[PDB]
């Protein structure tokens, strides 16, 4: 799921409380479509509602579908609310709180998002941007290795429980380590910003168990999203629970902090990328992958759907075979996920070509994917004992009404239904003959 | 992957703004600078990948101008304010030159766009457009350079948009017509920013979706070689295509070439 889907199901009060922070409003505005942004900007400096027809006349008739979609999305997000214009007309005006916060974020005004940074002076143990990036990469690699099950990576108990609640890994028995499921493989194949966003969404969903304020967590996350890289921020000014949540972020690599009691925290590159690098995989027409990577995580991920051939100290040469792709699919990974992963990790050299990946390789992978699903199997019960067409039609209509029909053929008067509905169909058939 | 580059050329001619300030009108150069900064902030807020550039023209030369609000936007506004203050404070009238060096600013903008295009990754295309706001009167002495700039922009497919404040310029109309840009005259100066947020804010693809005012009557009067003034009917050479206001027994340009 995406941000818009998550925000659609929230109550109006929660949405209004979210708009109280300028950082949240900017993120919501950037998540809007291109057409919606122009409407928001035009209505930013308006103190009076506008007629619905006047707004509808801005976009041409041919692109009315995009206008309708944008209007529906804005109404669902409650960015604007319809106003009862005098004379029976309907006026459209943006939410005053959202508009005020957006103007504060853009034009200026009010207090800063962070309390202060120069009160405590320069950090005694400050790090650099490459160090923060290395720390974030190490944390993410440790998390993903713990997802795989490598003993070298050990995380906190609550983090492991969160993965179990997310369904990526299941713990069949207490004490024994959980096993990664197909959903875990799909999560691994996802892009890093997508993985971070999915993990944050799962955290937000499970936050209701801990009784934490969703609005505060969302506002803090959005503030971290726009935070400048390499600049510390004041820990003070936050509730006790949020700091605890921040500690979990410290385990996730999004936020770096020297000590729990330290008053300085440095947002990392991964935290910035959460709101939204060059790729290290070269794909050749002969079904060969050349990866410029050294960490065991990427090697394992590539070996999930490919056969390894050579491992030079700074290079990995692998071959994409039919058997490897079939094994990966049997593991639960679809071809679309593999193609997306290859495109995301594609080397910058391959970006020169008009297609990111050669069409032949993608077509071959997709065809290999369809090989497993070529045969369709449906367990059920077949009825072929119809003496008359009229009797067959009534039973077929009853089965369709029950919604247990699998296959119908009026030409030969043969039908196939689910075993669960077989008892109901038999009871219906007996009643028709007995009552006759 | 959609890269939009917006370059804003600001006519900062001291004479016109001084006359406007002496008129004690509701519009000043400070309001224009604030409107330009707000437009740039809106453009940057439209998409993360969007890039902004501001160039201010003057009699001397062209200057590259580039707490509750965005941190990067705050730094950009501070840099723009510092640059414009440095340009205005050090602006000393040394000479009889009064026409705005609009051609030089456009040339610098084109050079900056060309520089930024190479740094763009091959997987993405950097769509670039140039917005020009005109305050002082147009200069007819720079006709050839202006036409060369227009042709260079057309070659690289760079939109040129003109926002005339007081006096209409035929050169800007020709540039908008040739490059496909939008030419608009401001009826009320204090409302200028709203126009910038209603017409020039959307990109070229977005402009097709929306409805825009029809282009104004574009003129195509040429400039005489020996007068550098707008003319309607003149003598044109059949070899070098030079334009003369009066008949001559021998073409000066052809006489120059040996
Ligand atoms: Zn002449
Ligand atoms: Zn001649």
Determine, for residues B45 and A30 on separate chains, whether the beta-carbon distance falls below 8 Å.
yes
Assess contact for B87 and B129: CB atoms under 8 A.
no
Residues B7 and B34 in one domain: yes
Q: Is A90 helix (H, G, I), strand (E, B) or coil?
A: strand
Stated as kind and residue range, the H or E segment containing B82 is: helix B71-89
Cross-chain Cβ contact B68/A34 below 8 Å: no
Q: Which residues contact A395 (CB under 8 A, 6 or more apart)?
A: A383, A386, A415, A425, A428, A429, A432
Interchain pair B48, A276: CB under 8 A: yes
Quote the CA–CA distance of A368 and A6 in Å, as a whole number.
35
B166 and B182 in contact (C-beta within 8 Å)? no
Q: Collect all residues with Cβ–Cβ distance below 8 Å to A73 and sequence separation of at least 6.
A: A4, A32, A33, A36
DSSP SS3 for A149: coil
In a domain, B217, yes or no: no
**Residue B21 placed within a domain:** yes
- Take residue A399 and report the two structure tokens written for it: 């089965």
Q: How far apart are CA A72 and CA B110, in angstroms?
A: 41
Ligand at minimal distance from the CA of B252 is: 2
Query: What is d(CA A258, CA A266) in angstroms, rounded to the nearest whole number?
Result: 9
Assigned token pair, A93: 């005006």
List of residues 6+ apart from B68 with CB closer than 8 A: A22, A104, A105, A108, A109, A110, A111, A112, A113
CB of A105 within 8 Å of a chain B CB? The answer is yes
Query: Which pair of tokens denotes residue A416?
Result: 């196939």
Say how far apart CA A253 and CA A100 lie, in whole Å. 33
Residues of chain B with C-beta less than 8 angstroms from the C-beta of A108: 67-69, 74
Same domain for B188 and B250, yes or no, is: no
What's the order of all strands across the beta sheet hosting B51-57? Answer: B62-64, B51-57, B2-11, B125-134, B159-164, B183-185
A394 CB-contact burial (10 Å; exposed 0-12 / middle 13-18 / buried 19+): middle
Helices (H) and strands (E) in chain A, counts: 20, 15
Question: What residues are paired with B185 via a beta bridge?
Answer: B164
| Distance (Å) from the alpha carbon of B148 to chain A's nearest alpha carbon | 31
The answer to whether the beta carbons of residues A396 and A386 sit under 8 Å apart is no
A401: phi then psi, degrees, rounded to nearest 5: -65, -40
- The answer to whether position B258 is within a domain reads yes
CA dist B123 and B10 (Å) reads: 32
For B105-164, what is the HEC assignment? Answer: HHHHHHHHHHHHHHHCCCCCEEEEEEEEEECCCCCCCCHHHHHHHHHHHHHCCCEEEEEE
* Phi and psi angles of residue B38, each rounded to the nearest 5 degrees, phi first: -65, -40
**Residue A381, exposed/middle/buried by CB under 10 A (0-12, 13-18, 19+)?**
middle
Total domains in the fold of chain B:
2
Pairwise CA distance, residues B16 & A302, whole Å? 66
- Please judge whether B210 and A110 are an interchain contact, meaning their C-beta atoms are less than 8 angstroms apart: no
Please check whether residues B141 and B58 belong to one and the same domain. yes
User: What is each CA distance from A264 to A131, A261, A323, in whole angstroms?
Assistant: 16, 9, 51
Under an 8 Å CB criterion, which residues of B touch A?
38, 41-42, 45-48, 67-74, 121-123, 194, 197-198, 201-202, 206, 209-211
Could you tell me which residues come within 8 angstroms of residue A341 by beta carbon, excluding any fewer than 6 positions away?
A189, A190, A191, A301
Nearest to A38 among B121, B123, B201 (CB): B201
Q: Cβ A38–B121 below 8 Å, yes or no?
A: no
- Based on the fold, state whether residues B133 and B27 are members of the same structural domain: yes
Q: Is-contact A218 A212, C-beta < 8 A?
A: no
B103 and B228 fall within a common domain = no
Sequence-distant contacts of A227-231: CB under 8 A, at least 24 apart: A227/A267, A227/A271, A227/A272, A228/A267, A228/B71, A228/B72, A229/A129, A229/A132, A229/A267, A229/A268, A229/A269, A229/A272, A230/A128, A230/A129, A230/A132, A230/A266, A231/A117, A231/A266, A231/A267
For residues B38 and B32, give the distance between their C-alpha atoms in angstroms, rounded to a whole number: 10
Q: At what angle do helices A34-42 and B29-46 cross, to 10 degrees?
A: 150
List the beta bridge partners of residue B163. B133, B184
Per the listing, tokens 């005020």 go with A100
Task: Please state the length of chain A.
Answer: 436
Separation of B226 CA from ligand 2 center, angstroms? Answer: 13
Residues B110 and B8 both lie in one domain: yes
Is B165:B196 a contact under the CB 8 Å cutoff? no
Is residue B250 assigned to a domain?
yes
Lookup result for tokens 């509750």: B68
Q: How far apart are CA B147 and CA A21, in angstroms?
A: 49
Cβ-based contacts of B69 with chain A (< 8 Å): 22, 104-109
Contact B49, B210 (CB under 8 A): no
Bridge partner list, B55: B9, B64
Hey, what long-range contacts does B242-249 have (CB within 8 A, 24 or more apart)? none
Same domain flag for B95 and B134: yes
> What 8-state DSSP symbol labels residue B216?
P
The number of C-alpha atoms within 13 Å of A275 and in the hemisphere containing its C-beta is 27
Write the CA distances from A145 to A82, A181, A268, A280, A312, integer angstroms: 51, 14, 20, 20, 22
Q: Where do we find the tokens 């429980």?
A: A161
d(CA A189, CA A338): 7
Question: At what angle are helices B14-22 and B29-46 packed, to 10 degrees?
Answer: 120
Q: Is residue B100 classed exposed, middle or buried when 0-12, 13-18 and 19+ CB atoms within 10 A define those classes?
A: buried
A60 touches B at CB < 8 Å:
yes
Report CA-CA distances (Å) from A43 to A182, A292, B41, B195, B229: 47, 49, 16, 13, 45
Cβ contacts from A onto B, under 8 A: 77
Separation of alpha carbons B176 and B161, rounded Å: 6
Closest chain B residue to the Cα of A56, Cα to Cα: B210
Q: Are B31 and B196 in contact (CB under 8 A)?
A: no
Domain closes at, from B172, B189, B210: B210
Say how far apart CA A153 and CA A141 lie, in whole Å: 9
Classified as helix, coil or strand, A18 is: helix
Angle at A267 between CA A265 and CA A272, to 5 degrees: 165
Count of beta carbons in the 10 Å neighbourhood of residue A9: 9
Half-sphere exposure of B125 (CA within 13 A, CB side): 6
Q: Can you give the resolution of this entry in Å? A: 3.9
Cα angle A111, A113, A114 (rounded to 5 degrees) comes to: 105
Are B8 and B40 part of one and the same domain? Answer: yes
Name every chain A residue with its beta carbon within 8 A of the beta carbon of B198.
Answer: 42
Distance CA A80, CA A54 (A): 15
**Phi–psi pair at A116, nearest 5 degrees:** -170, 160
Domain that holds residue B166: 1-210
Among candidates B48, B121, B209 on the partner chain, residue whose Cβ is nearest the Cβ of A351: B121
Identify the residue whose tokens are 């000043």. B28
- Are A357 and A343 spatial neighbours (Cβ–Cβ below 8 Å)? yes
Cβ–Cβ of B201/A112 closer than 8 Å?
no
How far, in Å, is the centroid of ligand 2 from the Cα of B245? 13
Q: Please, which residues have CB within 8 angstroms of residue B160's CB and are 6 or more apart in sequence?
A: B106, B129, B130, B132, B150, B153, B172, B175, B176, B179, B181
Task: Confirm or reject contact between A106 and chain B (CB < 8 A).
Answer: yes
| Residue A54 C-alpha, separation from nearest chain B C-alpha, in angstroms | 12
> What is the rounded distance in angstroms from the CA atom of residue A414 to the CA atom of residue B67?
75
Tokens 């214009």 found at: A85
CB A60 within 8 A of CB B212: no
Of B67, B69, B210, the CB nearest to A106: B69
Query: Rounded distance, CA A317 to CA A311, Å?
Result: 6
The whole-angstrom separation of Cα A78 and Cα B112 is 41
Q: Do residue B231 and residue B121 come from a single domain?
A: no
Q: How far is A223 from chain B (nearest CA, A)?
A: 11
**Å between A149 CA and nearest CA of chain B:** 36
Q: Which residues pair with B164 in a beta bridge?
A: B134, B185
Sheet holding A381-383, edge to edge: A381-383, A414-417, A405-409
Q: Are B130 and B150 in contact (CB under 8 A)?
A: no
Burial class (CB in 10 A: 0-12, 13-18, 19+), A238: middle
Rounded to the nearest angstrom, the distance between the alpha carbon of B224 and the centre of ligand 2 is 13
Residue B215 lies in a domain: no
Same domain for B242 and B143, yes or no, is: no
Are B53 and B162 part of one and the same domain? yes
CB atoms within 10 A of CB B120: 14
| B121 and B166 co-located in one domain | yes
Name residue, tokens 């506008």: A50
How close A394 comes to chain B (CA, Å)? 54
Ligand of minimum distance to the alpha carbon of B236? 2
Cα separation, A300 vs A166, whole angstroms? 22
Residues in chain B: 258
Q: In chain B, which residue's Cα lies nearest the Cα of A231?
A: B71
Work out the burial of residue A19: count CB atoms within 10 Å of its CB; fewer than 13 is exposed, 13-18 middle, 19 or more buried: buried
CA of B246 to the centre of ligand 2 (A): 13
CA atoms of B247 and B243, how far apart (whole Å): 10
CA distances from B90 to A351, B16, B30, B60, B116 (A): 47, 18, 17, 10, 29
* Ramachandran quadrant class, B68 (left: phi over 0; alpha: psi -120 to 50; beta: rest): left
DSSP A352-364: GSSSSS-HHHHHH
Q: In A334-388, where does DSSP find H-type helix?
A: 335-344, 359-372
CA distance B59 to B12: 9
Structure tokens at B197: 């947020």
Per-residue burial over A131-150, b = 16 or more CB atoms within 10 Å of its CB, e = otherwise:
ebeebbbebbbbbbbbbbee
Q: Which of A62, A67, A108 to mutate to test the interface with B (most CBs of B within 10 A)?
A: A108
B231 vs A179: CA distance, rounded Å:
84
A225 by Cβ neighbours in 10 Å (0-12 / 13-18 / 19+) ranks as buried
How is residue B185 written in tokens?
């005259």
> Hey, CA dihedral for A48, A54, A58, A59, is it positive or negative?
positive
């Amino acid at each position: 799921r995406n941000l818009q889907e998550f925000l659609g199901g929230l109550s109006p009060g929660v949405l209004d409380r979210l708009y109280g922070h300028p950082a949240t409003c900017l993120a919501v505005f950037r998540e809007l479509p291109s057409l919606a942004k122009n409407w928001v900007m035009r209505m930013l400096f308006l103190e009076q509602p506008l007629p619905q027809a006047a707004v509808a006349l801005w976009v041409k008739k041919e692109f009315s579908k995009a206008q309708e979609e944008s209007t529906g999305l804005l109404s669902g997000l409650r960015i604007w609310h319809t106003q009862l214009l005098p004379g029976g007309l309907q006026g459209l005006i943006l939410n005053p709180i959202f508009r005020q916060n957006l103007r504060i974020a853009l034009l200026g005004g009010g207090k800063a998002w962070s309390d202060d940074t120069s009160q405590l002076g320069p950090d005694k143990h400050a790090r650099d941007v490459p160090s923060l990036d290395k720390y974030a990469e190490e944390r993410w690699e440790v998390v993903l290795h713990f997802m795989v099950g490598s003993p070298s990576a050990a995380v906190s108990q609550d983090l492991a429980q969160l993965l179990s609640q997310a369904g990526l890994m299941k713990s069949t028995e207490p004490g024994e380590p959980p096993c990664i499921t197909s959903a875990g493989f799909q999560f691994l194949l996802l892009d890093t910003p997508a993985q971070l966003w999915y993990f944050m969404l799962q955290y937000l969903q499970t936050a209701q168990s801990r009784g934490m304020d969703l609005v505060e967590i969302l506002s803090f996350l959005f503030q971290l999203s726009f935070s400048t890289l390499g600049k510390d921020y004041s820990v003070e000014g936050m509730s006790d629970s949020l700091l605890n949540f921040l500690q979990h972020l410290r385990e996730f690599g999004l936020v770096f902090q020297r000590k729990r009691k330290s008053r300085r925290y440095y947002p990392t590159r991964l935290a910035i990328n959460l709101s939204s690098q060059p790729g290290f995989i070269v794909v050749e027409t002969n079904y060969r992958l050349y990866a410029y990577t050294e960490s065991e995580l990427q090697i394992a991920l590539i070996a999930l759907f490919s056969e390894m051939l050579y491992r030079f100290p700074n290079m990995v040469v692998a071959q994409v075979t039919r058997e490897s792709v079939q094994q990966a699919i049997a593991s639960g990974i679809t071809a679309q996920q593999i193609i997306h992963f290859l495109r995301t990790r594609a080397h910058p050299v391959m970006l020169k070509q008009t297609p990111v990946l050669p069409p032949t390789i993608t077509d071959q992978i997709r065809l290999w994917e369809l090989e497993r699903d070529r045969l369709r199997f449906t367990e059920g019960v077949l009825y072929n004992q119809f003496l008359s067409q009229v009797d067959f039609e009534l039973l077929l209509a009853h089965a369709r009404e029950l919604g247990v029909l699998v296959f119908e053929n009026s030409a030969k008067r043969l039908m196939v239904v689910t075993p669960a509905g077989h008892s109901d169909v038999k009871r219906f058939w007996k009643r028709q003959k007995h009552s006759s | 992957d959609e890269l939009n580059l917006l370059v804003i050329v600001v006519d900062a001619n001291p004479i016109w703004w001084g006359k406007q300030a002496l008129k004690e009108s509701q519009f000043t150069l400070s309001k224009c600078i604030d409107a330009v900064m707000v437009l740039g902030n809106s453009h940057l807020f439209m998409n993360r990948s969007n890039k902004l550039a501001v160039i201010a023209s003057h009699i001397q030369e062209s200057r590259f101008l580039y707490d509750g609000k965005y941190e990067l936007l705050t730094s950009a506004n501070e840099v723009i304010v510092e640059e414009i203050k440095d340009l205005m404070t050090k602006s000393d009238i040394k000479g009889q030159h009064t026409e705005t060096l609009l051609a030089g600013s456009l040339a610098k903008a084109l050079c900056y766009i060309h520089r930024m295009n190479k740094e763009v990754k091959d997987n993405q295309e950097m769509k670039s457009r140039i917005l020009v706001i005109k305050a002082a009167e147009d200069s007819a002495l720079q006709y050839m350079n202006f036409m060369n700039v227009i042709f260079a922009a057309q070659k690289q497919n760079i939109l040129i948009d003109a926002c005339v404040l007081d006096s209409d310029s035929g050169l800007l109309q020709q540039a908008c017509d040739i490059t496909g840009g939008l030419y608009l005259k401001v009826p009320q100066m204090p409302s200028l920013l709203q126009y910038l947020l209603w017409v020039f804010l959307p990109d070229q693809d977005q402009r097709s979706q929306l409805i825009l005012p029809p282009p104004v009557h574009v003129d195509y009067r040429a400039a005489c070689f020996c007068h550098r003034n707008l003319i309607e009917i003149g003598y044109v050479c059949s070899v070098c295509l030079s334009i003369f206001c009066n008949f001559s027994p021998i073409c000066t340009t052809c006489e120059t070439a040996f």
